[PDB]
Design a binder for this molecule. Structure first.
Ligand SMILES: CC[C@@H]([NH2+][C@@H](C)CC(N)=O)c1ccc(Cl)c(Oc2ccccc2)c1F
Ligand SMILES: CC[C@@H]([NH2+][C@@H](C)CC(N)=O)c1ccc(Cl)c(Oc2ccccc2)c1F
Lengths: 642, 645
């Protein structure tokens, strides 16, 4: 679907009124066709997807808005879908060529400290500028007042644009400031190229540089290129988030380029003294990061990956590389932030229908589609993998489930099989398949600053973004004609990750890699500050402050929850420690808290709740000191998407 | 818009109960079908996944009737093969609606055997085990987050043999987790089918020999409050007519003296007369201030505008219903032009014209031409005080005699008389009784709703929502009275009539404490009589909860209460109470909104964090949760609480 214009705020002292020009039916058809024949007027446009509605402000002949709402989408236009002219994911900014009849605001030259934010409801909210991207609302307003107004103009008194609104800065649920994209970030974006070629490795520079490599898996981004570099006489470290891919490079380089390299995973380590090393991000962090002098080039493969280990690992490289004597970091991926899924020559795509013997996410799979051969069916949860493997086995199709927890030996590597897997597949198994069938959804975590009492980590089923869809489809069609069947044809924008991933990085830091919160921050600071990487909201101060107060955890609990492989082993363990000290029962008796099961006779009363990590069945008390500290931490300034 | 079928849930054939979903329509197909009311796609399966524009849920055919919940479907028609099917049963009291099952749609069959191990099917095709605790209740064997169940209302509850016990309609929560489920019994679906499909209420009832509560569903024009009470009086009966509006009450009495003959008793705060006549007109507020029914006085009590869900009206009707048989009345009539489940039908005096973007005056995203409002007397309904004053401002500058009206301002600021454009909120409707040449409607309104947000307690949020069938009808009803009328509107939509929020239950206890010296226990009795009387607007039963909250709010400062009372704002007790607690800790209020003006004078002696009891708006000050009243309220949030899904 395309972004659709559904109305306009007309600007006129500054005042405004809004005008609606479409309803739901129209918005839906227009988004599907990409064809909008309505006459565009005004400088601010009310726009909408099938999900969110928001704004777009025309400046200098470009119509601008936020990446978090528009993604990389085309805008419906008179001739047809308009492709985006600019896409600056780093600045939460995208932009289309202004259609005829649109007026443009001209940039604010002088720069008043006094500024007015136009909202989607046609209000003109005064704002005092505090910095380049920061203004304080004269009247603190609830956060929900500003919702739907991402992409709206901030104006000086004369009516020239100072920037477009991108996020509220909340203090305990009330908006006291605003983050906007400066007009000078737009003029900078208009002066960068629309075509920077990243498909070739850079040549090694005289001094330190970070460089980007965009090219598909198989192209030898991970094999040929490190070899080429080794030939020129350099030492190269290749980081990867999969144990199975890292190990498989070992026997691959030996066969193919006569280099018997160093391999470093948690399960296995080989030192051959080769000039090339392949390691997981995880083993890299276990070994303390960059060793003084050991490497010239550090290639971070699958840098589109937004799990906590990769992020923490990449930001370690970026914080340490130059001081360890690196001259080159290369961030490598086939799917950088802002990518969309384009057709693939080797892959035929066929929507699923309702005609099929096997139900699947409201559609159907025909037995004939998966009876012969090797097939990969992605499902969102383990529960659903178990269900589908059971049905298929019961019809005599040779079927097998794989997800986090299982050994990859459930395999089966040669012969007929239907593999029903979660995304864990993409890290534990390196093989390709005759067809891929994709449910087009994933499970994700989201933090919610719910103040009940502190924060919550919700697990939610969500639509897949452009990176998931591409990575899943790319398990077929690798040098051999593949089919890709799907339940649904859309895809969310790529390259954004949630604040809970940040939280996960402190947790793993503390739990797994002996990092203080201060230390975790510095490495995340290096990641955030590097252009072209995935993006998130800057909630570092906040998570640092939270984990900073979580002291004298109980070793036994920590170990146990690490060994069960829970998410957030540190937060779970820490809550467990507080409970067992306070002589109080845990939030519930979910598996999550099994680590406390032998104290169940003696633990009684209300749970000293620190935060919410699932359903809380027990009564709660807010009197524990750690709770009060975490409550106090919620007064910090939180950027929120609006 | 119609309800559209967009998928189904196929139950298994044998062995253990299991199911899977089939999706038959996307969003685009769903909207088109809803707007045309036409659905040529055939219908298999007994459990349909159904949607509206705004939401989606389930329906379960049993005995040839496709049943769903009223809170989901309202009174809407079902998209069918030869166009929209109208509802056959609309049992608002039971949260139960029903269409005739379309061609070859298959139907579950009722729990013949009667077991107590149950299985709930959800929209995801999951199959939760449930233990029957009562006629209409069941506990989850493994409790669950209430969000798991969203979108499954309408879904069936099966016994092991595959037979339908009931349909899911609500989660019973404790602090965010669903311990239980409420469903509509299958035998409520048979009580429903075993009755007339059409019941009449168009005529005033005959006076029964013994106590009976009747409904009078009739236009404001049939003379619900003049003719019908005169007629009863003409036959020698003592009649009390209650009404929410002081203006309407005085008007009826004045009309009765000049028209139907006699000089009735009037009872309002601003005016009271005891003539000794046998008709008495009163407001619900004066009636409650007077302590309700005093025995022997009346044979018939007409509760006019019984569709109103302001707190006084509900608290009023609840009193009459608790007290009237024991006070010797023979008849309680519940009168309204717009009863629960009613739809806005067309009016022969009234031309209904969609606003467009063509026009000089912006109006909620559309536009009004000045042509349409210079020629005569017109009424513009706006949602806020703000928009009202803003739009007076614009119109008058354009050479129009416009005046704002809302709560606080004085009626008769409306010229009587002149040639006018009055810009008003719904306050118009209880403030002023005149009609107009045309009504212009924004089709939205401000309402309050409660959020059990546990942060630390609950939150009363004010929001703007689309108007319901009752709102549209009453607003439009201010033109086309006798003469010709024109109704112009921004949106054609209309939410289901007859449902009110738990926050309205909150205001009842609040008003009982602030205005009518009713302990919470006494308020619960009165509210209970209301919930239990059929054919009145419906709510979720949060009575124990709210009673328990207000029972803790003891020793309020009289002085603050009297100010929040006079200032006329919502929830004077909760506001006075929070301010009371704030003043006794020498702490500030949650913010300095106008809500808290009673504490401005103490500003310089108030310091530290606010001991927050509950959220009635933005909280700007830092908060402490250690006050004993906060803790007492936190304990109250462990009540069993019905919530919809
Ligand atoms: C413009 C700020 C930028 N964040 C900085 C910390 C830079 C960085 N390394 O991410 C940013 C860019 C793009 C988007 Cl969609 C942003 O907002 C969100 C919102 C929700 C999820 C993820 C990002 C954003 F916050
Ligand atoms: C079947 C329960 C019934 N409530 C009882 C207290 C009876 C009564 N007098 O209301 C009921 C009927 C209809 C509906 Cl839409 C119900 O659910 C809601 C949901 C949200 C708002 C209002 C009512 C309901 F809860």
């Amino acid at each position: 679907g395309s972004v659709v214009i559904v109305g306009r705020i007309i600007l006129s002292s500054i005042t405004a009124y809004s005008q609606q020009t479409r309803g739901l039916l129209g918005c839906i058809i227009t988004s599907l066709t990409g064809r909008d024949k309505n006459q565009v007027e005004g400088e601010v446009q009310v726009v909408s997807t099938a999900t969110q509605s928001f704004l777009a402000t025309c400046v200098n002949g470009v119509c601008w808005t936020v990446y978090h709402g528009a993604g990389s989408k085309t805008l419906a236009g008179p001739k047809g879908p308009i492709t985006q002219m600019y896409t600056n994911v780093d600045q939460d900014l995208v932009g289309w060529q202004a259609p005829p009849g649109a007026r443009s605001l001209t940039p604010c030259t002088c720069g008043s400290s006094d500024l007015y934010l136009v909202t989607r409801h046609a209000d003109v909210i005064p704002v005092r500028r505090r910095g380049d991207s920061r203004g304080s609302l004269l009247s603190p307003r609830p956060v929900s007042y500003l919702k739907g107004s991402s992409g709206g103009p901030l104006l000086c008194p004369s009516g020239h644009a100072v920037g477009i609104f991108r996020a509220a800065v909340c203090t305990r649920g009330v908006a006291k400031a605003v983050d906007f994209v400066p007009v000078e970030s737009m003029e900078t974006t208009m002066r960068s190229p629309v075509f920077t070629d990243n498909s070739s490795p850079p040549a090694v520079p005289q001094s330190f540089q970070v460089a980007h490599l965009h090219a598909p898996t198989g192209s030898g981004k991970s094999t040929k290129v490190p070899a080429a570099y080794a030939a020129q006489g350099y030492k190269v470290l290749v980081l990867n988030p999969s144990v199975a891919a890292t190990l498989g490079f070992g026997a691959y380089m030996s066969k193919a380029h006569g280099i018997d390299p160093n391999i470093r995973t948690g399960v296995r380590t080989i030192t051959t003294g080769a000039p090339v090393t392949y390691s997981t991000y995880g083993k890299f962090l276990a070994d303390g990061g960059c060793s003084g002098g050991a490497y010239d080039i550090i290639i971070c493969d699958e840098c589109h990956s937004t799990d906590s280990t990769t992020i923490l690992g990449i930001g370690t490289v970026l914080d340490q590389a130059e001081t360890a004597g690196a001259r080159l970091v290369v961030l490598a991926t086939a799917t950088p932030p802002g990518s969309v899924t384009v057709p693939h020559p080797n892959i035929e795509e066929v929507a699923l229908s309702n005609t099929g013997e096997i139900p699947f996410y409201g559609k159907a799979i025909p037995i004939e589609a998966i009876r012969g051969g090797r097939h990969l069916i992605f499902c969102h949860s383990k529960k659903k993998c178990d269900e589908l493997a059971a049905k298929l086995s019961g019809l005599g199709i040779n079927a097998v489930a794989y997800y986090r927890g299982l050994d990859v030996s459930v395999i089966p590597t040669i012969g007929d099989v239907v593999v029903v897997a979660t995304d864990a597949l993409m890290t534990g198994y390196t093989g390709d398949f005759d067809s891929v069938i994709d449910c087009n959804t994933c499970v994700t975590q989201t933090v919610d600053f719910s103040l009940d009492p502190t924060f919550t980590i919700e697990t939610t089923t969500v639509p897949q973004d452009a990176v998931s869809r591409s990575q899943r489809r790319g398990r077929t069609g690798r040098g051999r004609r593949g089919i890709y069947r799907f339940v649904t044809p859309g895809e969310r924008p790529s390259g954004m990750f949630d604040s809970s991933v940040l939280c996960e990085c402190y947790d793993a830091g503390c739990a797994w890699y002996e990092l203080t919160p201060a230390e975790t921050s510095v490495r995340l600071r290096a990641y955030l500050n590097t252009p072209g990487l995935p993006v998130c909201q800057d909630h570092l101060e906040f998570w640092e402050s939270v984990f900073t107060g979580l002291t004298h955890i109980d070793a036994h609990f920590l170990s146990q929850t690490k060994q069960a492989g829970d998410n957030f082993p540190y937060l779970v363990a820490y809550q467990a420690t507080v409970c067992a000290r306070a002589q109080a029962p845990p939030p519930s008796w979910d598996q999550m808290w099994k680590c406390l099961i032998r104290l169940k006779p003696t633990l009684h009363g209300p749970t000293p709740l620190l935060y919410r990590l699932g359903a809380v069945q027990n009564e709660v008390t807010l009197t524990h000191p750690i709770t009060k500290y975490i409550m106090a931490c919620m007064s910090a300034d939180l950027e929120v998407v609006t």
